[PDB]
Amino acid sequence: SGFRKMAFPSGKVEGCMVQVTCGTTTLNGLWLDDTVYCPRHVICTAEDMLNPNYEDLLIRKSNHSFLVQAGNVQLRVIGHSMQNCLLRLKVDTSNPKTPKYKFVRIQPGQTFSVLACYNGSPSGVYQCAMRPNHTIKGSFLNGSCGSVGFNIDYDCVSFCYMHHMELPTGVHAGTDLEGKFYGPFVDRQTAQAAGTDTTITLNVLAWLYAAVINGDRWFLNRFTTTLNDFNLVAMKYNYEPLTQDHVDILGPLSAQTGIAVLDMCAALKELLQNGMNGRTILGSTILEDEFTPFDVVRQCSG
Amino acid sequence: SGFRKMAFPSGKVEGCMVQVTCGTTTLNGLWLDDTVYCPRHVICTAEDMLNPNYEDLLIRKSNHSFLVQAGNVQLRVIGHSMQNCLLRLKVDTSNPKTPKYKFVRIQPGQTFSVLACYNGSPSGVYQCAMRPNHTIKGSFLNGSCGSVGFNIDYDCVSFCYMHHMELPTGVHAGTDLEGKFYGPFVDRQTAQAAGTDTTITLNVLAWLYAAVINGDRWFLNRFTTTLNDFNLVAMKYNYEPLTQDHVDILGPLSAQTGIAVLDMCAALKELLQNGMNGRTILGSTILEDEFTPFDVVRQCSG
Ligand SMILES: *[C@H](CC(=O)OCC)[C@H](C[C@@H]1CCNC1=O)NC(=O)[C@H](CC#C)n1cccc(NC(=O)c2cc(C)on2)c1=O
Ligand SMILES: *[C@H](CC(=O)OCC)[C@H](C[C@@H]1CCNC1=O)NC(=O)[C@H](CC#C)n1cccc(NC(=O)c2cc(C)on2)c1=O
Fold it and tell me: How many angstroms separate the CA atoms of A171 and A181, rounded?
């Protein structure tokens, strides 16, 4: 019945994306009740990037210094504070399109949809995963900062990402909605590097479980193996190692397909060794690891 | 700055997705002003699939025979007609969340976002392209029919797709919002086949133009070639042939990168002949053809 990388619907978040300008510099922010969250680097000038004192740069501002527009209509600011790497700006008006929501801090290999925005307007939406090295392989132009990542859960919106910046390799770094960065990164134009990235092993498996449910069984083999043998191979190929928790978590997809997590791992193990022979799994010629167990069922079961 | 497959934001459409039940059978429909469009096969029973008389099956129904719920609140039906392969159901109430909109009939290789829905609720959103053989490689479970495809253009929503059914290969068929199918397909459980599929040549190019703007130039070469030589190779590899219109259309990305459409085609030509040597373009190990010229700029320029 098909397997696509698919995002959550964006409407609920769309109604929360306001424009924040401070002096000249203009980026997106998130409007939940009478707060507007945006990156603190909104207060920076082109120079205040190599080495900026935020606490200081900010002590040189007031509520009226910041301009917040919903589509075209300004919100009057009445409070402005620093929340780690964000600004928490109080506003005269509380958002009428504010959904049920929570702020969460996703673990690496966990996924979220990004809503890419410019001057407060949403430009598009795509799925991605939080890398082990604590990065994102997003698509983000200049003015994209403030753009958010989120998981929906019925009518509840869980915010997990706000975009701050791009790193050397061409990869993206940002923070939770508590303004606390992901990985060891800082809001400055210094030379910072993402660590070496591993492959999210659990996700790769879930993706085979999905290939199977989608009638794609070629790479299946008879061989089994122990978590122990498999972990030795995983290290070679820079795969994140498998914890029994992970195998328990694949239980539902395991039972659902009548393939034992460890039988599947044996199939993977082989693929890591025996290439793919220019075949395709679900149409991919590489091992997709941006799909959680949860992603897989949700799509393949309701 | 990154290149992702990204959908348009779904909010505008989200507010248009109602549940339509007729007897037992329950699928999604689209609520624009006081009309509800849904597939006509809503009126079918499990048996009325191999060979159903719709005009007849429908002549055996009235306005109250159909149940339309917005989230949970019923819309009173006051008119029910057949619009080719859709139903046009009139309702007591006009939709308060109806956007500016038009109904268009995209050409093959043109793309749209799909909003996958179940019992009137949106489940997720993904980009795809209308294949040359007039199919879609979507992800669609049972109850997904009624789900729509669309292009946004500032605040205007252009509807181009409604989902009717799956075909042998694992591919998806449906219609425009005039109820007129795409390709030679019919709303019946007969054996219908998609033609052989070609590769959307223009899109493959735009995707290299994007790889280039995203600092990915390895596959570039010195060789040029004429539209004529390139078309001969295209046929071999089941690529859709290049019309000068197509090359004119790549003009903006051409100028934008200082690579001449025909210089780029020469690079492609080579790739079709000289594999990829297990390299990646924009991280893909195959030639991506689900990206229009227009898709490419929009993402890489605002
Ligand atoms: C924020 C955009 C925004 O809205 O703010 C301006 C109004 C951007 C997002 C970037 C632009 C390109 N791609 C992105 O993801 N972030 C920045 O530009 C940050 C600002 C902060 C903090 N920033 C500032 C200065 C330099 C850099 N870049 C690098 O450090 C860097 C080094 C290498 C190599 O590649 N990038 C940066 O992200
Ligand atoms: C519509 C789902 C819906 O909401 O209607 C039921 C309430 C589905 C969408 C399908 C389900 C699985 N994947 C999809 O994209 N469409 C149908 O099930 C249609 C109905 C019509 C018209 N339909 C009916 C009967 C058979 C088939 N399938 C095939 O013809 C077929 C043959 C092979 C091989 O694979 N599929 C069908 O789509």
Answer: 15
